[PDB]
Subunit: 242 residues, 2 copies
């Protein structure tokens, strides 16, 4: 991942990007995307295109309170009034991580892609500067790495989270199912079910297929969005309740 | 990737697998795939199914790589090694790159077994496997044994997907290949498939239901070929 560091880039930005395996370039590449560190923001650009992508949680809470269709059921899916800790295994741009943290939950947001993790990190950094989003941003802990591969070690380190939240961005044929995304889904769900203390929550399109082709214990259905909930391995549905 | 090592696994197999970041397991996983090392073979399995995937090696592309010039070829997307073997069959020395641990392990074992087989020994000896991401390993290999004559490629929120997804990986792959090859970068594509990384090639070879877009190294004058 290339990163163009403009002369106006603040010291905060310069220090932040230094923690990511990026490749500083003196000019934009001839093709494709690259990161741009200008002023006090890190953004992602596409050569030849004006529109960019930036993580900005300023209107996050507002956008959430106004969303309909089922996405607003995320709070009930993780049982937010129980004050659970949550590991967001597919953080990406952090939309859901910020929403969860805004409910008062302590979130560990996993993101394995260098560019995306950097974008998210800067978004959290800027969120801490705004008095209206400071408290929430402080409850978001970025974990730069692959969740399936690193959750087991983190469990031994700081204990199991109450909730593991998943929202994959996907919703020779036989061979591809064995080594491709299908297999990755199997491993992610399995690892999440060995990790969560209370539930593994998976966001899905209304008619979306079940993650790893596995049926959940119960679901929270909206019009166009739903949440599949799996109980941790060895949990007795008789004791558990929702 | 999990690997179940049966007690019958030969030392040749036990040695081969040590080159990959595989997770040894005492029993198959609850669900999904895993590698099985039994007797003198490494195979891929799916829990619940009786079948198994194994690499067993027992003219359009020839022109695309201009085999007549007997060029060295680097297969940046080796996979199960089908095209690596074909290229090697033409008498060319091939260096195959594969980044997936399971796929790489399977290919490595197929090459190893092919060497033990008379009718494939000659061809298999011309295939060298390199584990890792091509975009990353090729530059490092260049500084070692030098540039190859040809780099062979055969891969396979919207805006966001294009910037960090497969679209970007394509750009990186082609760019690196064009900086590695000394003569040509050959890309396999379906009959009327779209251009890789959305870039136009210098020329191409259209076959029955397949096509090969050919790019030239950076700073190359097409008029000289």
């Amino acid at each position: 991942t290339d990163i163009l560091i403009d002369d106006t880039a603040t010291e905060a930005v310069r220090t932040l990007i230094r923690a990511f395996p990026l490749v500083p370039v003196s000019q934009p590449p001839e093709q494709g995307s690259y990161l741009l560190a200008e002023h006090d923001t890190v953004s992602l650009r596409l050569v030849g295109e004006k529109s960019n992508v930036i993580v900005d949680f300023t209107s996050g809470a507002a956008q959430y309170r106004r969303t309909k269709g089922g996405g607003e059921l995320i709070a009930k899916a993780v049982n937010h009034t129980a004050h659970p800790t949550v590991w967001d295994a597919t953080a990406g741009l952090g939309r859901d991580s910020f929403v969860l943290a805004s409910l008062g939950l302590t979130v560990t947001a996993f993101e394995q892609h260098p560019a995306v993790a950097c974008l998210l990190s800067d978004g959290i950094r800027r969120a801490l500067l705004n008095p209206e989003t400071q408290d929430t941003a402080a409850r978001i802990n970025l974990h730069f790495g692959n969740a399936a591969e690193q959750m087991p070690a983190l469990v031994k380190t700081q204990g199991k989270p109450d909730i593991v939240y998943l929202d994959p961005m996907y919703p020779m044929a036989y061979f591809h199912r064995l080594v491709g995304e299908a297999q990755d889904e199997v491993v992610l769900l399995h690892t999440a079910r060995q990790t969560a203390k209370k539930r593994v929550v998976v966001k899905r399109p209304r008619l979306g297929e079940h993650l790893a082709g596995q049926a959940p214990a119960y679901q929270y259905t909206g019009k166009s969005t739903r949440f599949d909930v799996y109980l941790p391995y060895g949990a007795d549905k008789g004791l558990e309740h929702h």
